[PDB]
Design a protein around this ligand. Structure first.
Ligand SMILES: [Br-]
Ligand SMILES: [Br-]
Ligand SMILES: [Br-]
Ligand SMILES: [Br-]
Ligand SMILES: [Br-]
Ligand SMILES: [Mg+2]
Ligand SMILES: [Zn+2]
Lengths: 213, 242, 49, 948
RNA sequence: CCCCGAGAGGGGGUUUUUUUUUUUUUUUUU
């Protein structure tokens, strides 16, 4: 099959089988390989998620010259739940826009800050699901950047409510990103309030993690 | 074994043409002024081709720069909706396509005066919107027209044509049905000459029939040159008169 | 596998002669029941450099 | 839209949807509208000025006569334009020489016919292509002509547009032919066109239906019988829709195959299905559903309760299918089914005779009658006719139109009158076309491929002559063997000579043997109509009456024929072999020869034996015979078979007319002379062509006989004569068959041989890429490889072998058609079928003439019991070569007292003219009174035999 | 060679894809 991997025999076919509000866990700086890293685990109802973020930078960019730094974000599929490459790219773009509003790029001329988020373990226990993972990604990237020592304007956090994801800064006064799939009609005000509550809780736990730990 | 009348005893083909008749040939110059220095929209039969010539301009990488000549690049984009049956995979890295791109470059390297544009790059982007036989010949005509529109110096026209061989009967300008039912020969003739820039035979042809097939193609390619030249002078008069 | 899956052989025709592709049985894994892997524990080595 | 081009040419868009395998694809092709479409009429004076030559620089010929069939006004002189339906239904009437002389077939019609029925389309094209001074058909490309091309109007069905298109063509032709006073008649059964013309809204168009048109012809009464057309107790179920059966086959619910219906039982059929091991039975008349023998039918499995002992959903039907496969393995109960669709009818032009029971002599008007087909495996057909009294005792040709669900018997129409039954003309003609043998003379297109010289063609005196080399550049490769002493040994009245032999003694002690075969390839070239017809016929059939040639007379019985005293082209094979007939080397070469003398088998033998003539030629002939003995010896030692079936030769009275004498052909030593060298030639060529073309070599194999075929023969031998055949090897089979001889009767050995020949596997042609090397084996000849090469005039297989050998030696490159595995498969499957049809027609010809010899004669002849049953016995008369059946009722008196012992194959009974219990075993030589009587039901001359 | 400066100074001469009308005896010459 592939000349770079061992994928086994081709006639083989994969095994198909027959028939509080949120619980968080935060850890930072456990990857010596990079500059900043974070572990974010969430458990709620019939879905738990364990994702790992890793920040590599600021490192060299050998092309032209830039007064500010350049951020790149890449999401990788984990072991269990898989997602479309397109969908992972879309979230990556959405995350790039968010942290280009938070990261003090002016302090890193001709430098690159490459942020990796590994969707290691995403279990679906219900015996576009990507929308519920987005706030946890932002939490991991924020923790990793702060752990790396990359300057941030403010602790960026987010929340999710009925397929709507919105990330806040400045005590929830302003918005650094808005995401909406499916959901209902004229439910904007309700989503903003519910997400700001999650944003506030996540921000408190993040600060608590960056300080005490 | 074909149950269809590829060439009836009345000397008529499936589309109505006779053995020595070209398809509907309609050229179009300066179709994308805001996208390229030169552009051409080709309609040869059901074939629909957009050709864009971008340059001569600065190379994006100084590593790839020639101080004696311009760098000529050709990328053919055969869209997934070019045929009746939509292709699932892309053709961008297909070996068949890489050969086509390479072939086209090797053709115009000896026609386009690259020597008078040193330290520059000429990028030729092609989009095949619809395909119906003789796509190689149509690709040649599209590049020649677009290059001229860009005001890029060249020695002469290069006209492309395809000729099929149904047993003993030669068929000028083949469509998809005819190509599936017989071997075809693609020609790239320089100007009004007998000299071939491109000779392409991919299927079996008797050695005795090949010379006659070439003779038909060259004659047909000369007519393609005349149509290209005609439409070009027409556009020239409409622009120079303002 | 299903006791008697309706899907049987698939007939494919040639230029005059006929042939039948063997019936492919869809193997299914049990949702719950499982057996442990039979590892030669005497052979399990551990790594060091 | 529509675009106008520079040439005055136009172009539009033809877009349609192609449904394939449940798929939907939008197909779009461009449609060019011309302005130079010829009317192809002799009267026209405008079209020839606008016509253009084709690819081969040849202007099309205007064939439509300037003075067509004139009919009563206001029709007058007229051309006929056909509709799609009248073509599909009355194609037979369209081929009738006594009507439809000038016919115009629109392109749109030709296209619809092609899609609806390809074989009819081919027959229609043949009428156009083979246009002569009697019949003239053309194809007017109306869709391509801008003048006649019509486009679909808003809210208009495609069927109405096409009918309007045909009507527009008639309108155009009418206006176009006005100055020549030639009207046009639209023959259509469609009520839409007739109504549109009756109202006469736009233009005046003469519209007639098929039956209505026939009633306007001078010979209406002679051709009215060719028009295609309560009668039940029950009603057949409707056939499934095409969409249903297509989904059924795809979902493993329905199954297609060829159905067999035996003459012994018309209420039971069996289909051969790939998914099932044993053939699925079809019991009942409703279940057979109007199916014929040999038809490709689609069957549906009946419920398990409806099976024979000798569901709703698709899931249950596939489970039923599995239970059916299980039941076939158990051999206790066997699954049954019902036909629900007829894929491909085996219908054709059949030969039969009217049943006197269904015709009323008192009736004067049209009446329905029945015709008994010569095929005993086929039902009878209903016929509408008025000349029922004139067709009473004659062999007639009929064609089946349809078989409605209501009607009990299929419906058809009359075609031709072959003649009175039991006549040499009618019986021979019926015999040929029943075995699918084209006997019609070669068309003009075929004869045009012949040399322009004609019968005065001659091989060039010098093979280096500038003129001769200019015309034939391959002449330099032609060897010169006109110094050799070539002679041909063929039957008395043989004019088509294929082979020619010679022999010289080389100075090194070895012999030079040369077999020379007619160079047919030099005259027949691939692609030509001559080659086309040659491949179609496959082989020439041989009858006592006539001789239907594969190639024209000018070619086969003159030019290519290796006649004596003349220079002839030939493909020669020369060996150098020792005195023990062992090949040292072999060379193949195209040459030019001159036959010294064309001997007969009797004439050649006498010249060899007389010992008075010791000329160089005769000395070579004896050398051939001497080497023939050596070659035949080694071959038999190698394991060659020696089967036998010397059929009788009808010695027609050359003083009267009807045949009177039946003799037997004797095998002379010259027959073994020719046979051995023909085999030697075929073997060497087979080895050479296969070495050159390992994947497309035209060869011929013979499968080894199964044990089951000889188990019954060995059963009768070990029981009665206490003997057996080994079957271990070909040599073992030959040795055991050889010792199988009775001292009290010399013919016993011949009887066993002619009977053990019936249990041999049929030899077939094939291409070397279809099988592996061990499968090239020829059992009956004990050779690893073999082909046919020595008779290209009468066998198309040899033509292929010739072309392959020519490419093998490098004389001329082999045509692409003989290097295509697909094309070679079609050639082999055709010549195999034509070969079987040739021998069967040949044996049938013997059957008729011999049956006419014993027509009004009774004679006590010698007979041999070959089959013993409880219903009677079957005896063979070697004198006439005819097998006869003696039924128990006519075998003996008191049928309830007779007993049959299967273990001993003995039939004991008490003869009619006696009262003594006689035991009749098998293989017994018995006295039998011969007698012939035509059966009043089958109309076949059978030989009723009464033993004594 | 080209650009620059009242005084032979300086700057440059470019880096795998439109392929499927299915049936009952050997061999030779006809
Ligand atoms: Br592997
Ligand atoms: Br034809
Ligand atoms: Br089946
Ligand atoms: Br003839
Ligand atoms: Br002579
Ligand atoms: Mg002969
Ligand atoms: Zn005319």
């Amino acid at each position: 099959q592939d000349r770079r991997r061992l994928l086994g025999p081709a006639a083989a076919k994969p095994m198909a089988f027959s028939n509080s509000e949120q619980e968080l866990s935060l850890h930072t700086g456990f990857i010596e390989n990079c500059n900043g890293s974070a572990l974010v685990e969430a458990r709620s109802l019939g879905h738990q998620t364990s994702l790992i973020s890793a920040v590599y930078g600021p490192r060299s960019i050998r092309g032209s010259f830039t007064s500010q730094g350049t951020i790149s974000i890449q999401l990788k599929n984990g072991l269990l739940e898989k997602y479309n490459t397109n969908e992972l790219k879309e979230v990556s773009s959405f995350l790039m826009g968010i942290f280009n509003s938070v990261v003090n790029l002016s302090r890193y001329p001709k430098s690159g800050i490459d942020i990796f988020v590994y969707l290691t373990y995403d279990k679906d226990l219900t015996n576009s699901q990507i929308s519920s993972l987005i706030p946890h990604c932002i939490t991991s990237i924020t923790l990793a950047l702060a752990d790396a020592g990359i300057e941030l304007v403010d602790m960026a956090g987010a929340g999710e409510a009925n397929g709507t994801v919105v990330s806040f800064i400045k005590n929830g006064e302003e918005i650094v990103g808005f995401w909406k799939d499916d959901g209902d009609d004229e439910d904007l005000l309700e989503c903003l309030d519910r997400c700001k509550e999650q944003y506030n809780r996540y921000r408190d736990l993040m600060i608590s993690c960056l300080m005490n730990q | 074994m074909s149950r269809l009348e590829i060439y009836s005893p009345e000397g008529l083909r499936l589309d109505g043409r006779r053995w020595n008749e070209l398809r509907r040939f309609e050229s179009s110059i300066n179709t994308h002024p805001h996208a390229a220095d030169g552009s051409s929209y080709m309609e040869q039969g059901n074939n629909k081709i957009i050709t864009l010539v971008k340059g001569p301009k600065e190379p994006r990488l100084k590593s790839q720069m020639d101080t004696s000549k311009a760098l000529l690049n050709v990328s053919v984009n055969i869209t997934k909706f070019s045929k009746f049956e939509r292709s699932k995979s892309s053709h961008k890295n297909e070996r068949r396509v890489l050969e086509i791109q390479t072939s086209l470059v090797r053709m115009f390297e000896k026609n386009v005066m690259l020597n008078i544009y040193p330290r520059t790059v000429i990028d030729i982007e092609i989009h095949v919107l619809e395909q119906d036989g003789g796509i190689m010949g149509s690709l040649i005509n599209g590049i020649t027209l677009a290059l001229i529109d860009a005001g890029i110096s060249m020695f002469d026209y290069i006209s492309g044509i395809s000729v099929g061989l149904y047993d003993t009967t030669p068929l000028l300008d083949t469509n998809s049905l005819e190509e599936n039912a017989m071997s075809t020969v693609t020609l790239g003739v320089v100007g009004k000459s007998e000299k071939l820039s491109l000779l392409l035979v991919e299927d079996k042809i008797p050695l005795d029939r090949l010379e006659n097939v070439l003779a038909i193609g060259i004659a047909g390619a000369h007519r393609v040159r005349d149509l290209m030249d005609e439409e070009l002078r027409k556009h020239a008069q409409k622009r120079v008169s303002n | 596998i299903d006791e008697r899956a309706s899907d049987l052989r698939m007939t494919i025709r040639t230029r005059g002669r006929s042939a039948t592709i063997r019936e492919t049985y869809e193997i299914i894994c049990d949702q719950t029941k499982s057996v442990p892997l039979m590892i030669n524990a005497k052979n399990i080595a551990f790594a060091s450099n | 839209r529509r675009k106008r081009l520079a040439d005055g040419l136009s172009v539009t868009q033809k877009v349609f949807v192609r449904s394939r395998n449940g798929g939907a694809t939008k197909i779009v092709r461009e449609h060019y509208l011309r302005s130079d479409i010829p009317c192809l009429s002799r009267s026209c004076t405008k079209c020839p000025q606008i016509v253009v030559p084709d690819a081969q620089n040849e202007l099309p010929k205007f064939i439509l006569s300037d003075s067509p069939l004139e009919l009563s006004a206001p029709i007058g002189k007229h051309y006929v334009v056909l509709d799609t339906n009248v073509v599909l239904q009355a194609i037979d009437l369209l081929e009738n020489p006594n009507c439809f002389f000038d016919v115009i077939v629109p392109q749109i019609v030709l296209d619809e016919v092609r899609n609806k029925s390809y074989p009819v389309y081919t027959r229609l094209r043949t009428l156009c292509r083979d246009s002569d001074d009697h019949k003239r058909f053309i194809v007017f490309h109306n869709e391509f002509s801008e003048h006649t091309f019509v486009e679909r109007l808003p809210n208009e069905t495609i069927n109405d547009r096409n009918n309007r298109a045909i009507r527009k063509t008639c309108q155009w032709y009418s206006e176009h032919l006005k100055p020549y006073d030639i009207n046009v008649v639209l023959v259509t059964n469609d009520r839409l066109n007739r109504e549109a013309a009756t109202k006469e809204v736009e233009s005046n168009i003469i519209t007639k239906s098929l039956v209505q048109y026939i009633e306007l012809l001078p010979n209406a009464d002679d051709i009215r019988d060719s028009i295609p057309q309560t009668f039940s107790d029950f009603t057949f179920p409707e056939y499934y829709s095409t969409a249903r059966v297509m989904g059924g086959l795809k979902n493993g619910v329905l199954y297609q195959g060829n159905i067999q219906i035996s003459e012994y039982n018309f209420l039971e059929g069996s289909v051969s299905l790939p998914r099932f091991s044993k053939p699925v039975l079809i019991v009942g008349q409703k279940n057979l559903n109007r199916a014929f023998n040999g038809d490709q039918v689609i069957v549906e499995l009946l419920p398990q309760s409806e099976w024979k002992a000798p569901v709703i959903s698709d899931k249950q039907r596939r489970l039923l299918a599995k239970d059916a496969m299980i039941a076939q393995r158990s051999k206790k109960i066997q699954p049954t089914a019902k036909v629900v669709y007829i894929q491909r009818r085996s219908w054709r032009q059949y030969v039969g005779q009217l049943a006197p029971s269904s015709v009323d002599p008192q009736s004067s008007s049209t009446q329905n009658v029945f015709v008994i087909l010569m095929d005993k495996c086929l039902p009878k057909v209903r016929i509408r006719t008025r000349r029922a009294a004139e067709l009473l005792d004659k062999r007639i040709v009929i064609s089946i139109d349809s078989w409605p669900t209501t009607h009990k018997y299929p419906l058809g129409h009359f075609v031709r009158d072959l003649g009175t039954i039991e006549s040499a003309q009618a019986e021979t003609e019926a015999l040929l076309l029943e075995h699918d043998v084209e006997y019609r003379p070669f068309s003009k297109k075929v004869l045009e491929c012949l040399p322009a010289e004609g019968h005065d063609w001659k091989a060039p005196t010098k093979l280096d002559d500038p003129e001769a080399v200019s015309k034939d550049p391959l002449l330099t490769k032609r060897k010169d063997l006109r110094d050799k002493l070539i002679c041909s040994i063929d039957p008395p009245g043989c004019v088509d000579i294929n082979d020619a032999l010679h022999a010289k003694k080389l100075p090194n002690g070895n012999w030079e043997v040369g077999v020379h075969i007619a160079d047919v390839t030099h005259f027949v070239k691939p692609g030509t109509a001559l080659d086309a017809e040659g491949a179609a016929r496959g082989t020439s059939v041989y009858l006592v009456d006539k001789r239907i040639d594969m190639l024209p007379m000018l070619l086969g019985t003159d030019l290519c024929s290796l006649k004596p005293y003349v220079d002839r082209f030939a493909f020669s094979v020369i060996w150098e072999l020792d005195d023990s007939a062992n090949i040292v080397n072999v060379n193949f070469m195209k040459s030019v020869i001159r036959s010294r003398e064309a001997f007969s088998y009797e004439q050649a033998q006498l010249r060899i034996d007389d010992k008075t003539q010791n000329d160089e030629l005769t000395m070579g002939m004896r050398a051939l015979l001497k080497l023939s003995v050596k070659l035949k010896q080694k071959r038999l030692e190698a394991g060659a078979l020696n089967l036998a079936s010397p059929e009788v030769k009808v010695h027609m009275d050359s003083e009267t007319s009807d045949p009177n004498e039946v003799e037997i052909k004797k095998l002379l030593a010259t027959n073994s002379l020719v046979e051995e060298f023909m085999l030697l030639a075929n073997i060497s060529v087979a080895r050479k062509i296969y070495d050159a073309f390992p994947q497309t070599a035209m060869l011929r194999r013979h499968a080894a006989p199964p044990s089951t075929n000889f188990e019954i023969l060995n059963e009768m031998l070990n029981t009665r004569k206490n003997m057996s055949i080994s079957l271990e090897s070909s040599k073992a089979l030959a040795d055991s068959l050889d010792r199988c001889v009775d001292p009290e009767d010399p013919y016993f050995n011949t009887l066993v041989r002619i009977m053990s020949t019936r249990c041999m596997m049929a030899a077939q042609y094939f291409y070397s890429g279809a099988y592996s090397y061990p499968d090239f084996r020829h059992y009956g000849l004990a050779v690893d490889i073999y082909t046919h090469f020595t008779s290209p005039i009468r066998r198309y297989c040899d033509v292929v072998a010739h072309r392959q050998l020519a490419g093998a030696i490098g004389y001329e490159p082999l045509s692409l058609t003989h290097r295509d595995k697909n094309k070679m498969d079609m050639i082999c499957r055709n010549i195999n079928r034509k070969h079987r049809n040739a021998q069967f027609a040949g044996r049938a010809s013997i059957e008729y003439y011999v049956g006419q010899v014993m027509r009004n004669n009774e004679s006590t002849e010698t007979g041999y019991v070959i089959k013993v049953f409880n219903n009677g016995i079957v005896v063979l008369v070697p004198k006439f070569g005819v097998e006869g059946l003696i039924r128990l009722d006519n075998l003996t008196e008191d049928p309830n007292s007779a007993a049959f012992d299967e273990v001993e194959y003995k039939l004991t009974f008490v003869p009619t003219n006696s009262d003594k219990p006689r035991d009749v075993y098998v293989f017994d030589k018995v006295e039998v009174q011969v007698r012939s009587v035509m059966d009043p039901i089958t109309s076949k001359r059978k030989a009723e035999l009464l033993l004594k």
